[PDB]
Amino acid sequence: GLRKMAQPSGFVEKCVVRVCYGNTVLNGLWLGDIVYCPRHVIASNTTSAIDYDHEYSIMRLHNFSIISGTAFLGVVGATMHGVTLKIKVSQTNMHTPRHSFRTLKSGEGFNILACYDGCAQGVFGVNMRTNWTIRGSFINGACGSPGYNLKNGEVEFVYMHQIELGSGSHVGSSFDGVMYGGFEDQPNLQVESANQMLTVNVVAFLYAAILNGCTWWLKGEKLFVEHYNEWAQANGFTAMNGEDAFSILAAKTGVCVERLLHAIQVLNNGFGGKQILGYSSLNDEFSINEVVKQMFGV
Amino acid sequence: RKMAQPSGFVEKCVVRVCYGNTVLNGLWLGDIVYCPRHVIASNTTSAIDYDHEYSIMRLHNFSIISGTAFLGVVGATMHGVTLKIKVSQTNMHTPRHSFRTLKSGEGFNILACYDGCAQGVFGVNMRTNWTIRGSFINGACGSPGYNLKNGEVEFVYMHQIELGSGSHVGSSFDGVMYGGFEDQPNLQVESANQMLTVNVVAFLYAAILNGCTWWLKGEKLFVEHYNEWAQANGFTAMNGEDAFSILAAKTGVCVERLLHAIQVLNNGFGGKQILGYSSLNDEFSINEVVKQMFGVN
Ligand SMILES: CC(C)(C)[C@H](NC(=O)C(F)(F)F)C(=O)N1C[C@H]2[C@@H]([C@H]1C(=O)N[C@H](C=N)C[C@@H]1CCNC1=O)C2(C)C
Ligand SMILES: CC(C)(C)[C@H](NC(=O)C(F)(F)F)C(=O)N1C[C@H]2[C@@H]([C@H]1C(=O)N[C@H](C=N)C[C@@H]1CCNC1=O)C2(C)C
């Protein structure tokens, strides 16, 4: 089978805190002696354009309350970096995991720990879409929820939740304070670009299908990558690139990528009542790495 | 969006259980390590006499590792398709917990583990044929299924076998295999899966709450009539329409109008989608819909 999994959340859970300032509560991430959180926690009035330089100049540190579980942390300073605050606290988080910070590229997979009131409530794997939004399930109080990847025994922190667009899509920032997609932490209408289906992931999905004995859709005709990309630009798919990355899957199956590109074109019109590993339509949720990991443990 | 509950409380309980050449996962709670009994079987490609295997078990063949610490085995007893291995060490990270047995259609979380280390977490439903749609390869046995409720962990599933169809079967922690399946390497076939009607209705209510209403008509289908159609078309009966009376009041749409949509939509969406799906979806319970959109349990 093929299931969209999250990487385990235990290491990240110990870092989530509640950040309160004046009349707002949201979540922060406590690493070392710093708590990271969205800067709009200090905005007194969010019904019109926020002058964050002004809000920062009037910010008073005694209005913060930072809570780890049931313990209060002492706040000693706070600086603004893009759309984030780095709040310096008086104790080191002794549960800080081995970590780094990374900025997601388009299509890259990660995990969201959905937090409310400083406490984790759900965890899920997700992909950064080409329009720099994600389909999260975030409601009131979710800001500051962290996105992460586990790699080589290290936690990479990649996302801090910030806003919900009118479409229902979700936008966050890196921990550098750069909002994905250049969206603003401002209460005005913002519209995202059209989403594209991630071709590299659909291809990985079709390989997984072959490996599971689901091959009714597979045919012998190939479609060259340059010809597929001409078709993809006009039909809402990303272009194919990095074909060599599929070598492990092509070897195990004996099916070249260009035969799967041909399949994408035909199956984009619908499955006609058939299913591929349980889906009634093409699926771009799984990367090459996830397919290889779940089928072969590599 | 399909999500799982956080895994941090369960992760501290997973251990590596090795007996001779076999390695799988165990669950360390108090001074007991729970794991599948086939860890002690000498040959798992032919029929297994577990009473024989238990009578020749030698405890020095066990190695149990939590993180990098070795646990000391002092006894082991067999209960159904599980072993309860008593160790000297009490797990100081044992959460408040209970053991519960899943009902047909009930949702829960799997922590997929290998070599005694968690690798992934995902939500699943116990299906009407007592299998789950998991994703496991060699070494996954003993991976635990859990729910977080009322400040405790409910442990509900221990992974055991993969059927020839790819469906997965586990046991409760009292050693009862879900569905009555055997921990034997023989051909066993599951019964036909049914679509969980209550979950489809929740999905359609979620569609209405997101203003996705192209499919919604005005005709009502009485519960008794729907159920007659469902028994012949691979759907479960509608039951407990009262839990949906909160959403019926909130949307102004009665369950009978959704039952009629299921019957119509089961023939296909005709190129349209519902919340991004091209066919009826039974993966989301009323609990999940309400938790994710309204924040309440
Ligand atoms: C959706 C809302 C209309 C409220 C607004 N959106 C837009 O103003 C936009 F459309 F312009 F983006 C919006 O997100 N905010 C308004 C205000 C902050 C942010 C906000 O409250 N964030 C929440 C953090 N706890 C997470 C949200 C809550 C609902 N679901 C979420 O994910 C700031 C931009 C300073
Ligand atoms: C799939 C396999 C053909 C190997 C077999 N299936 C059948 O015998 C059947 F089909 F009948 F069910 C089977 O699951 N097992 C053979 C042997 C144990 C069990 C087994 O290996 N459990 C794994 C635990 N680490 C679970 C994972 C799940 C994914 N793949 C696995 O191996 C026992 C039944 C004693």
d(C-alpha A212, C-alpha A267), whole Å: 18
Q: Can you tell me the distance from the alpha carbon of A230 to that of A223, in angstroms, rounded to the nearest whole number? A: 11
Range of the domain at B221: 197-294
H or E segment and range at residue A100: strand A99-101
Strand partners, A154: A151
**For chain B, give me the number of helices (H) and strands (E)?**
7, 13
Q: Where would I find the H helices in A42-120?
A: 52-58
Alpha-carbon distance B219 to B221, whole Å?
7
Residues of chain A with Cβ-Cβ distance to B278 below 8 Å are 270-271, 279-281
Cβ-proximal residues to A221 (8 Å cutoff; 6+ apart), any chain: A259, A262
Residue type, A219: K
User: Out of B3, B138, B273, whose CB is closest to A122?
Assistant: B3
Minimal CA–CA distance to A162: which of A63, A37, A45, A43?
A37
- Cα separations (Å) of A25 from A15, A90, A146? 17, 20, 16
A10/B11 CB distance under 8 A: yes
What Rg do the C-alpha atoms of chain A give, in angstroms?
22
Q: Is A185 exposed, middle or buried (0-12, 13-18, 19+ CB in 10 A)?
A: buried
Q: Is the C-beta atom of A18 inside 6 A of ligand 1?
A: no
Q: Please identify which residue in the block is written with the tokens 């190695």.
A: B63
B246, two tokens? 């909160």
Cβ–Cβ gap A8/B111 under 8 Å: yes
Q: How far is the C-alpha of B33 from the C-alpha of A55, rounded, in Å?
A: 55
Q: What angle do CA A154, A159, A162 make, to 5 degrees?
A: 155
> Burial of A192 by CB count in 10 Å (0-12 exposed, 13-18 middle, 19+ buried)?
middle
Q: How many CB pairs under 8 A join A and B?
A: 106
Write phi, then psi, for B215 (nearest 5 degrees): -85, -10
Residue B226 phi/psi, 5-degree rounding, is -50, -45
Q: Which two tokens stand for residue A70?
A: 């049931």
- Residue B261: phi and psi, rounded to 5, are -65, -40
Tell me how far apart the terminal alpha carbons of chain B are, to the nearest angstrom: 16
Sheet with B14-19, strands from edge to edge, namely B69-71, B62-66, B14-19, B22-29, B32-36, B82-87, B73-79
The verdict on a CB contact (< 8 Å) between B6 and A124 is: no
> Is the CB of residue A196 less than 8 Å from the CB of residue A237?
yes
**Bridge partners (DSSP) listed for residue B27:** B14, B34
Nearest to B81 by CA among B35, B45, B49: B35
A297/B138 Cβ within 8 A: yes
Give the span between the Cα atoms of B51 and B97, in whole angstroms: 30
- By DSSP bridging, strand B69-71 and strand B62-66 are antiparallel
Nearest-angstrom CA–CA distance, A253 and A266? 20
Distance between CA atoms of residues B94 and B97, nearest Å: 8
Cα–Cα distance, A101 to A176 (Å, whole number) = 8
Q: Is A167 on the interface with B (CB under 8 A)?
A: no
Say how far apart CA B174 and CA A294 lie, in whole Å: 29
* Amino acid residing at A240: M
3-state secondary structure at position A75: strand
A46 Cβ below 6 A of ligand 1: yes
Distance B193 CA to ligand 2 centre (A): 20
Distance CA A118, CA B9 (A): 16
How far, rounded to the nearest angstrom, does the alpha carbon of residue B108 sit from its chain's CA centroid? 5
- A56 burial (CB, 10 Å; 0-12 / 13-18 / 19+) is middle
Measured torsion, CA atoms of residues A46, A48, A51, A54, in degrees rounded to the nearest 10? -60
CB of B243 shorter than 6 A to ligand 2: no
Look up residue B3 and give its DSSP letter: -
Contact A113, B6 (CB under 8 A): yes
CA angle B124, B127, B131 (to 5 degrees): 85
**Which tokens hold the place of A88?**
């310096």
Q: Dig out the tokens for B40 from the structure.
A: 């002690």
Spatial neighbors of B213 by CB under 8 A, at least 6 apart, are B207
If you search the block for the tokens 């349980």, which residue do you land on? A278
Strand partners, A156: A100, A149
Q: How far is CA B162 from CA A85, A294, B136, B139, in A?
A: 48, 14, 8, 12
> How many residues are present in chain B?
297
Residues in Cβ contact with B90 at an 8 Å cutoff, skipping those fewer than 6 apart: B30, B31
The shortest C-alpha distance from A63 to chain B (Å) reads: 27
Answer for the pair A273, A215: CB distance below 8 angstroms, yes or no.
Answer: no
Put simply, the chain B residues between 95 and 114 with a CB less than 8 A from any chain A CB are: 111-112, 114
* Residue A248, both tokens: 């492990």
How does strand A64-68 pair with strand A71-73?
A: antiparallel
The burial of A163, by beta-carbon neighbours within 10 Å (0-12 exposed, 13-18 middle, 19 or more buried), is given as buried
How close A124 gets to chain B, by Cα (Å)? 5
Which residue of chain A has the CA closest to B9?
Answer: A10
Tokens, residue A148: 């992460």
Q: Rg for chain B (alpha carbons), in Å?
A: 22
Extract the runs of DSSP E, i.e. beta strands, from chain B: 14-19, 22-29, 32-36, 62-66, 69-71, 73-79, 82-87, 97-99, 107-114, 117-125, 144-149, 152-162, 168-171
State the best of B68, B121, B133 to mutate against chain A, taking most chain A CBs within 10 Å: B121
**Technique that determined the structure:** X-ray
Owner of token pair 């990240």: A12
Å from CA of B236 to ligand 1 middle: 40
What's the token pair of residue A283?
Answer: 């699926």
Q: Is B141 a catalytic residue?
A: yes
Q: Using most ligand atoms within 8 A of CB, pick from A132, A135, A145, A163 the residue to mutate for ligand 1.
A: A163
The single-letter DSSP state of residue A96 is P
Residue in the structure block whose two tokens are 């299998």: B131
Give the pairing of strands B168-171 and B117-125. unpaired
User: Distance (Å, rounded) from C-alpha A7 to C-alpha B227?
Assistant: 40
How far apart, in whole angstroms, are the C-alpha atoms of residue A277 and residue A298? 21
Q: Which two tokens stand for residue B49?
A: 């006499």
Encoding tokens for residue A142? 């979710």
Cβ–Cβ under 8 Å, residues A287 and A295: no
Tokens representing A92? 């080191």
Residue A159 to residue A183: CA distance in whole angstroms:
14
Taking alpha carbons only, the member of B165, B164, B166, B160 closest to residue B183 is B160
Neighbours of B139 (CB within 10 A): 18
Instruction: Assess A116–B contact: CB distance below 8 Å, yes or no.
Output: yes
Assess contact for A115 and A69: CB atoms under 8 A: no
The answer to whether residue B7 neighbours chain A at the CB level (below 8 Å) is: yes
The two beta strands, B82-87 and B168-171, are unpaired
- Tell me the CB-side half-sphere exposure of residue B6, using CA atoms within 13 A: 22
Give the Cβ contact number of residue B69 at 10 Å. Answer: 9
Among the listed residues B154, B142, B183, B162, the one whose alpha carbon sits nearest the alpha carbon of residue B35: B142
d(Cα B162, Cα B103) in Å, to the nearest integer? 20
Q: Which residue has the tokens 């492990």?
A: A248
Q: How far apart are the first and last CA of chain A?
A: 16
Please give, rounded to a whole number of angstroms, the shortest distance from the CA of A198 to a CA of chain B. 15
Tell me if B197 sits within 8 A of B238, measured CB to CB: yes
H or E stretch covering A158: strand A154-164
Query: How wide is the angle at C-alpha B285 spanned by C-alphas B279 and B286, nearest 5°?
Result: 115
Which neighbouring-strand residues pair with A20? A25, A65
Q: Give the CA count within 13 Å in the CB-facing half-sphere of B99.
A: 12
Find out whether A200 and A107 touch, Cβ atoms under 8 Å. yes
- A163 within ligand 1 shell (Cβ under 6 A): yes
From CA A66, how far away is CA B211, in angstroms rounded? 38
B191: DSSP letter: P
Tell me which amino acid residue B104 is: S
Other beta carbons within 10 Å of A51: 10
Cβ neighbours for A143, distance < 8 A, ≥ 6 positions apart? A26, A27, A37, A38, A40, A41, A160, A161, A162, A163
The enclosing domain of B214 has a CATH number of: 1.10.1840.10
Which residue has 């969206």 as its token pair?
A183
Q: Residue B123, CB half-sphere, CA atoms under 13 Å: how many?
A: 21
